[PDB]
Design an enzyme around this catalytic site. Structure first.
Site, PDB file in Angstrom:
ATOM      1  N   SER A  49       0.952  -1.236   0.065  1.00 49.43           N
ATOM      2  CA  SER A  49      -0.093   0.017   0.169  1.00 49.43           C
ATOM      3  C   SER A  49       0.960   1.280  -0.150  1.00 49.43           C
ATOM      4  O   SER A  49       0.389   2.447  -0.271  1.00 49.43           O
ATOM      5  CB  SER A  49      -0.988   0.010   1.306  1.00 49.43           C
ATOM      6  OG  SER A  49      -2.182  -0.899   0.853  1.00 49.43           O
ATOM      7  N   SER A  96      -6.498   2.976   2.641  1.00 49.82           N
ATOM      8  CA  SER A  96      -5.833   2.063   1.589  1.00 49.82           C
ATOM      9  C   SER A  96      -6.653   1.045   0.624  1.00 49.82           C
ATOM     10  O   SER A  96      -6.431   0.071   0.349  1.00 49.82           O
ATOM     11  CB  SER A  96      -4.729   1.187   2.313  1.00 49.82           C
ATOM     12  OG  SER A  96      -3.875   2.132   2.950  1.00 49.82           O
ATOM     13  N   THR A 187       0.658   2.851   6.033  1.00 41.52           N
ATOM     14  CA  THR A 187       0.976   1.594   6.238  1.00 41.52           C
ATOM     15  C   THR A 187       1.084   0.728   5.247  1.00 41.52           C
ATOM     16  O   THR A 187       0.412   1.045   3.962  1.00 41.52           O
ATOM     17  CB  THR A 187       0.182   1.150   7.488  1.00 41.52           C
ATOM     18  OG1 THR A 187      -1.076   0.860   6.888  1.00 41.52           O
ATOM     19  CG2 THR A 187      -0.014   1.730   8.721  1.00 41.52           C
ATOM     20  N   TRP A 189       1.225  -3.738   4.070  1.00 35.44           N
ATOM     21  CA  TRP A 189       1.269  -5.236   4.513  1.00 35.44           C
ATOM     22  C   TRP A 189       1.310  -5.963   3.459  1.00 35.44           C
ATOM     23  O   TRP A 189       0.314  -5.843   2.658  1.00 35.44           O
ATOM     24  CB  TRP A 189       0.331  -5.567   5.504  1.00 35.44           C
ATOM     25  CG  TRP A 189       0.461  -6.855   6.097  1.00 35.44           C
ATOM     26  CD1 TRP A 189       1.023  -7.972   5.763  1.00 35.44           C
ATOM     27  CD2 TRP A 189      -0.021  -7.267   7.468  1.00 35.44           C
ATOM     28  NE1 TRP A 189       1.005  -8.717   6.604  1.00 35.44           N
ATOM     29  CE2 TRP A 189       0.335  -8.630   7.844  1.00 35.44           C
ATOM     30  CE3 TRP A 189      -0.723  -6.450   8.516  1.00 35.44           C
ATOM     31  CZ2 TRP A 189      -0.067  -9.154   8.770  1.00 35.44           C
ATOM     32  CZ3 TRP A 189      -1.037  -7.213   9.802  1.00 35.44           C
ATOM     33  CH2 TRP A 189      -0.635  -8.315   9.708  1.00 35.44           C
ATOM     34  N   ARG A 229       2.658  -2.084  14.340  1.00 34.89           N
ATOM     35  CA  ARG A 229       3.651  -1.314  13.599  1.00 34.89           C
ATOM     36  C   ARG A 229       3.226   0.207  14.134  1.00 34.89           C
ATOM     37  O   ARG A 229       4.572   1.034  14.523  1.00 34.89           O
ATOM     38  CB  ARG A 229       3.146  -1.247  12.229  1.00 34.89           C
ATOM     39  CG  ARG A 229       3.604  -2.453  11.312  1.00 34.89           C
ATOM     40  CD  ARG A 229       2.833  -2.522   9.955  1.00 34.89           C
ATOM     41  NE  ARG A 229       1.345  -2.412  10.112  1.00 34.89           N
ATOM     42  CZ  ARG A 229       0.537  -2.560   9.019  1.00 34.89           C
ATOM     43  NH1 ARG A 229       0.868  -2.573   7.867  1.00 34.89           N
ATOM     44  NH2 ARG A 229      -0.819  -2.632   9.415  1.00 34.89           N
TER      45      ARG A 229
END
Length: 243
Positions: A49, A96, A187, A189, A229
């Protein structure tokens, strides 16, 4: 000048989370490395992302969309319920919402995307042949040092895009805001690898205006909270007196 920072304490933080990670901080052409796996700093990973920041730049620069456009939800079940609505590019940024960024990538189209990613020099700059998932599953990979350099330049309006576009994409990135300190970022992942990479990449705007950029990059497990995170980032930024 890329150096290992004063790391005794942040090392421990990463250990105490049972992860392998690096935190890269850039504060005015000094880049410091922290964490318990410093060799990650120069290792390429799928951006996931975090690429949305560059996708948005390219799309706005080339006038494929604008910050008022409402991307319509056509009615199909999406990976998250929160994504199941009409939204702007900026709201998509915050959530996102992959389908919106895929719709934008497909408008940009493969050539223009490849030419722009090479011009910017983002990571290995390889997007392959599939315009709508290259930042999700490869082949595009980028190092944490390269990510911090990228966000630092965005924060300072130093990327090779229009000033207005850069300002418009910064405005989409605000995460949190207290004590006069603003935290911007994204962020990511990459949940499908043979090894799952987690990102949090962004900057702090301190009260006097100063910018300190970061890129956290760590090995994710499904056992973990997604929040891990942000928790490691904020603890580390506090320890380093950046916030």
């Amino acid at each position: 000048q890329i150096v290992q920072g004063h790391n005794q304490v942040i090392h421990q933080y990463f250990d105490e989370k049972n992860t392998s990670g690096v935190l890269v901080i850039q504060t005015d052409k000094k880049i410091n490395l922290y964490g318990n796996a410093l060799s990650r700093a120069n290792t390429e990973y799928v951006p996931a992302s975090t690429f949305d920041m560059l996708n948005a730049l390219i799309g706005l620069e080339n006038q494929k969309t604008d910050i008022n456009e409402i991307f319509k939800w056509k009615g199909e079940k999406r990976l998250f319920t929160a994504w199941e609505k009409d939204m702007t590019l900026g709201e998509a940024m915050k959530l996102s919402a992959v389908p919106v960024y895929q719709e934008l990538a497909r408008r940009i189209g493969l050539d223009l995307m490849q030419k722009e990613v090479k011009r910017i020099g983002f990571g290995n700059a390889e997007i392959g042949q599939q315009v709508d998932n290259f930042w999700l599953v490869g082949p595009l990979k980028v190092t944490p040092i390269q990510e911090v350099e990228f966000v630092s330049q965005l924060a300072h309006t130093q990327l090779p895009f229009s000033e207005k576009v850069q300002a418009n994409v910064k405005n989409m990135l605000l995460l949190e805001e207290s004590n006069g300190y603003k935290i911007f970022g994204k962020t990511g992942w990459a949940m499908n690898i043979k090894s799952q990479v987690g990102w949090l990449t962004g900057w702090v705007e301190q009260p006097d205006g100063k910018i300190v950029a970061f890129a956290l990059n760590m090995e994710m497990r499904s056992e973990m909270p997604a929040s891990i995170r942000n928790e490691l980032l904020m603890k580390s930024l506090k320890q380093l007196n950046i916030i």
